[PDB]
Amino acid sequence: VGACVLCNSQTSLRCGACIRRPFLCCKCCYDHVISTSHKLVLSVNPYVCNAPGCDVTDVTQLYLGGMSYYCKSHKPPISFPLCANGQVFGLYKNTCVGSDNVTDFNAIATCDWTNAGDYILANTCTERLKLFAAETLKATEETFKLSYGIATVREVLSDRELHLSWEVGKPRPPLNRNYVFTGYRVTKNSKVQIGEYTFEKGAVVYRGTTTYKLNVGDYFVLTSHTVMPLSAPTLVPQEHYVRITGLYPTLNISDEFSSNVANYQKVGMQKYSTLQGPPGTGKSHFAIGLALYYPSARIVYTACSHAAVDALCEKALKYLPIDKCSRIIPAVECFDKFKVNSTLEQYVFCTVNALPETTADIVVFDEISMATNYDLSVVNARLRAKHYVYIGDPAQLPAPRTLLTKGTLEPEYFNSVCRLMKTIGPDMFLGTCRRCPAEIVDTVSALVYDNKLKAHKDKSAQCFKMFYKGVITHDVSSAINRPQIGVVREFLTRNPAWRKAVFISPYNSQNAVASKILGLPTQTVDSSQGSEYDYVIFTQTTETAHSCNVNRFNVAITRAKVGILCIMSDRDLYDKLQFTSLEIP
Ligand SMILES: Cc1ccccc1-n1cc(C(=O)O)nn1
Ligand SMILES: [Zn+2]
Ligand SMILES: [Zn+2]
Ligand SMILES: [Zn+2]
């Protein structure tokens, strides 16, 4: 028994064909089963023919005779159908409303989540459907990883490199940091974990979360966890205030955080606020300075990845009393300079999926473009706070949609918070970039920020761009452009100062080849987010939809502090690059 996902009308009915099995009142349970392929219906018992040897599960072909359900061939003389009069039989038949259109709820439950339009509807629908779509999408993603085969150690060629044997019949998952395997050893009766691993083409290379003398017979599987149901909404009801509520500003603040005093008060005059922070604008500076401005405020700093949650710890280590902090870790290594697992410690730093159930004066959700509507609902479910601050940049990169292949996901569809920022604008906007040269800022400002991003540094005069298509070769699940890597090599022979540069590309296979031919550190654009390097050498590799993505190309050129070389394939972003042009040797 539970609340309907369409009309809230109390129900004792659940759809058996939906992987989340939402409670559906007789009206909505009916309009769903007759308009889709979903026919299995669950209540206290399953609506299935209780006759020996019968396989009828469709509720339209089932009748309730006595207290057991049968079909047309197995029903008693005294029976009435379970599915008629626009209602499926179940408790609370008098309390049943119905919706003007269930069509939105149907496409959510039937879609394979491989199209961009599936994620659009999952973000525009009613709030209760945003929660249901988040579970359905995430439970689908946790199940698709079971479709991938098992990799087994056929040979241990050396350290750091392996020879893998893959399962038959099932496909193989791509080998990049977006897929994180988990190993096992063949014990007596069952198996035991031996850390998490990531792989890449060589035989394959690996990188282990822990070090081991792993041997033949060990196997790796993408660990899929549970998808618990969502109760709280993605966003609490917004409440604007006339005074600062529940918070108390300081009389003495330092000149380091003085330019934020207006926004720190803005945080106290809203139930929740949004802060867009382009690269180099000082987002973690903002989040920690907010603590000094409201000194006695219990603040919970949170994000999805431990890396983002640890970057806040580094700044809290630089400004806040250490005995007032705590790092929450569930029983991969992370920041271990605060007392671990102390929920009653003023400043709490934790990931979303590990969040305890507690209250706080302020909550700081960092790097919000990575979040999903599932994460947003968990934060509101575990954390009941007075003010919610959402820090991020919807012009940066979103969470990887491992099923999405057709179409492109726009920033307003990343999550509910990014929808507000890209439509009604963000409550706050850090508009000065103190990291990149002027040519980079003057490029991403017009590209994704409506010319509202101001450069603090001057022109570095060391930003260059070349238009070289070259030769594109493909492999299993990545692309490789060696003539672009070769152009970089010929550039490096005439610019040996650019050998302290980081090589960045949209494809990790391009990084692997570039690591062998150039010897520069490698980062995919998605792995480079949140990090700054002096020099960056970027090869777009292709002009597919993946490499031309403006939120990716924004991150691709903003990691530079001094200079950058961009070997471009797409003419569009090549002309949008305000860089000194170079010719092809
Ligand atoms: C990077 C940045 C951009 C803008 C404003 C402040 C900062 N920042 C200063 C500090 C520090 O003093 O540690 N951290 N971050
Ligand atoms: Zn269904
Ligand atoms: Zn309903
Ligand atoms: Zn039957």
Side-chain angles (χ1 to χ4, degrees), residues 113-114 119 140-149 151 164 166 171-176 178-183 195-201 204-206 208 220-224 332 399-405 476-478 506-508 524 526-527 546:
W113 304 99
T114 74
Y119 303 93
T140 301
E141 291 176 343
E142 297 295 302
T143 275
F144 184 78
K145 302 183 297 181
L146 309 183
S147 161
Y148 280 134
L164 286 189
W166 290 90
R172 313 178 186 184
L175 306 180
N176 27 89
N178 279 124
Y179 300 107
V180 188
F181 293 83
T182 301
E196 305 182 84
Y197 294 82
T198 57
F199 300 84
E200 194 169 336
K201 192 199 191 77
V204 300
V205 189
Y206 74 83
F220 304 98
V221 184
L222 306 174
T223 295
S224 61
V332 183
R401 267 67 174 183
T402 48
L403 318 180
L404 171 54
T405 53
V476 279
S477 49
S478 194
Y507 304 100
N508 65 335
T524 41
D526 311 86
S527 63
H546 174 70

Side-chain angles (χ1 to χ4, degrees), residues 2-14:
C4 175
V5 297
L6 276 251
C7 296
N8 209 336
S9 308
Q10 185 163 5
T11 317
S12 169
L13 288 175
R14 307 182 285 109

Side-chain angles (χ1 to χ4, degrees), residues 265-383 385-455:
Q265 294 179 344
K266 207 176 199 299
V267 165
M269 305 183 66
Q270 296 185 186
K271 184 53 161 246
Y272 70 87
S273 58
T274 65
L275 167 70
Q276 177 165 8
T281 59
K283 291 182 289 298
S284 51
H285 204 68
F286 186 102
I288 304 304
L290 177 72
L292 298 150
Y293 190 78
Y294 300 113
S296 56
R298 164 168 159 83
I299 306 183
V300 174
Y301 295 87
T302 185
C304 295
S305 63
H306 289 277
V309 179
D310 291 336
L312 292 169
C313 299
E314 303 287 347
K315 201 82 62 180
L317 206 66
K318 208 179 187 188
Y319 294 100
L320 300 177
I322 230 188
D323 43 307
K324 289 290 185 298
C325 297
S326 180
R327 183 73 166 91
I328 310 295
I329 324 169
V332 183
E333 288 202 348
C334 60
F335 184 95
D336 58 350
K337 289 178 179 178
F338 300 143
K339 57 148 70 78
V340 178
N341 294 337
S342 181
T343 245
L344 304 182
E345 212 64 73
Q346 175 164 346
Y347 300 116
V348 169
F349 301 76
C350 183
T351 29
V352 179
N353 48 19
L355 266 178
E357 197 171 296
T358 178
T359 53
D361 303 298
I362 313 181
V363 165
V364 199
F365 203 165
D366 209 332
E367 201 179 12
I368 206 61
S369 62
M370 296 301 301
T372 62
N373 283 324
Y374 194 101
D375 313 308
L376 292 165
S377 175
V378 175
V379 179
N380 289 320
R382 311 295 293 184
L383 294 174
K386 298 183 179 181
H387 306 269
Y388 295 88
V389 192
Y390 301 101
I391 306 186
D393 184 3
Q396 293 178 211
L397 286 165
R401 267 67 174 183
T402 48
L403 318 180
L404 171 54
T405 53
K406 306 188 214 169
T408 329
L409 184 69
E410 296 296 343
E412 62 180 325
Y413 307 133
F414 290 177
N415 47 93
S416 288
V417 163
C418 290
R419 182 151 196 79
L420 292 184
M421 295 181 179
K422 292 292 295 183
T423 57
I424 73 169
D427 291 281
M428 297 154 301
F429 184 96
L430 310 175
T432 293
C433 167
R434 322 191 71 202
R435 172 208 293 175
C436 313
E439 311 87 330
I440 289 174
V441 180
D442 283 319
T443 301
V444 303
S445 200
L447 187 60
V448 289
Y449 303 124
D450 272 275
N451 301 271
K452 299 182 302 178
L453 186 60
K454 309 310 172 192

